[PDB]
Design a protein around this ligand. Sequence first.
Ligand SMILES: CNC(=O)CN1Cc2ccc(Cl)cc2[C@H](C(=O)Nc2cncc3cc(Cl)ccc23)C1
Ligand SMILES: [Cl-]
Lengths: 291, 300
Amino acid sequence: SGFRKMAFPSGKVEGCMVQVTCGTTTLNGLWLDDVVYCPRHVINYEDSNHNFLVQAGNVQLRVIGHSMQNCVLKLKVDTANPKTPKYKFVRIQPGQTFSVLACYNGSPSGVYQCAMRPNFTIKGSFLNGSCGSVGFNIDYDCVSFCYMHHMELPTGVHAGTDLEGNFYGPFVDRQTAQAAGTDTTITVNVLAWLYAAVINGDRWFLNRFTTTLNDFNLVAMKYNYEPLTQDHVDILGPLSAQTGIAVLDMCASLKELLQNGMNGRTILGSALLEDEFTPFDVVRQCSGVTF
Amino acid sequence: SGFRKMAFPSGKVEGCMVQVTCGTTTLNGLWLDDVVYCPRHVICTSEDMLNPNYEDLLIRKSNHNFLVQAGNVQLRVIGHSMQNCVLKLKVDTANPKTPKYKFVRIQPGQTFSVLACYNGSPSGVYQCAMRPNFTIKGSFLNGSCGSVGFNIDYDCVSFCYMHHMELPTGVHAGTDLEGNFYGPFVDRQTAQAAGTDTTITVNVLAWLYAAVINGDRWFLNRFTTTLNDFNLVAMKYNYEPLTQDHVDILGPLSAQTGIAVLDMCASLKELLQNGMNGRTILGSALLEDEFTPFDVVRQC
Ligand SMILES: CNC(=O)CN1Cc2ccc(Cl)cc2[C@H](C(=O)Nc2cncc3cc(Cl)ccc23)C1
Ligand SMILES: [Cl-]
């Protein structure tokens, strides 16, 4: 029993964190094999090796080459990381969740779970020096790196890139007028969390009613919720079979929660509808998958 | 900017997790140097749990009855002893990944990271607090016994909790790493039941100072309170009494924001009376109590 915002174990990523210094700027880098990946803003970006100081623990790595790939700088070093895990670089979509290992001076300080918002920002917890901190998921023994932190927006939310340097969202790496778009709630994730509450014994919100997908979406649009697609309904299939509550049956519960509130009640210890757990996260946490 | 429930990086603890099997029971163990620490109930059957005589069950065991697996390697048990509710298995190999560590017993209100494990394999990490009623609101399934709670301040891991059981309300009970339970619980299938839980007042105040630091003051008021009047009101909402120690501990956050502890206490009194009126504090519609004054100073 219990339901927590759970991050993946961070050990495989901790063994890759390094400190990168170029002039007066100091930030974090990801050391995989003989390459250190970090935000290019550490340095018209196109306009020597020894100018880059890379520190792995108490050891100085020697930079023997450098190149740029989109908004990421790739520093060829003379030593391969002996702690390099099995990995892939993957680009995630809004609504997908991931763990963040927040680092300062190449030293990991904390791990937390978060989601890529529909407006492509992340509600992270980062201070100055956190640039280059990374987001990841683990599937079997392979780390899938999906995010590298680049900046904080005026509303206190965060923007970054995939590990190939492509930003998530319409953001650019530089000091200019930038803002996050109006955000929306991740509907498929709220439904997954309502199934998690039912699995944990919280059923006061269930009702005898159902709805069509079209009528539900007319309601979701009104409350700044993302449209629910047939794909989302298919993805919720296993949780629907485990609890015996049809997806459109759970949509009618959500419609009543949106139109009437919680009436002084909570769901999984929360007074707000939670959208940072995917259907896969709910299945994994209520099954015990290990790494 | 931002404020998240943050756990310590789990790597140093992942390198200590092993699987312990005794007969048909399989759970997790913590491998530090040449000793594997695990819940003593690994030697029990389900029937034994009603009234187990651990000393009688243990005397009938030899070293080779305990199977310890570290990754794909079988460790050899060369000795065993019981210390309170923990079994200590002396093994033939010292853990080369043993971090710098201490065993620390925590008090209610203290927070810690939990590395939830199954079959000696870590599956997830989360942050939580020792509740005033000595239970933890964890997320654990069958096979999670032996999962550990810890803090890492600097490069030293301070082990403070080992998971032993789930209570009928879905909450969790366990011991420090010397085998002493937190709370009036026993590693026996008995009634026991968690006592009525209360809100950790010093932690809610710390989190209100975190909201002020991050730029939000909508909840402040022009009032102050005495410590006694605050405690009289707070006890009516099932909040823990605030002591002079808690007031002293909030001193640095009070000096950083310029808001006296008893002035923040007045804002807490008013929040309990009024609710939030459709507003949130650090993205939450409830008053959060699982961040200590130390955690706020660390994260903000
Ligand atoms: C609820 N308990 C049971 O069904 C059987 N239990 C009885 C029992 C009694 C005393 C002691 Cl010290 C340990 C145990 C065992 C126990 O509590 N382990 C579990 C630990 N954490 C989460 C658990 C979630 C689940 Cl769903 C099951 C089992 C968990 C085994
Ligand atoms: Cl403590």
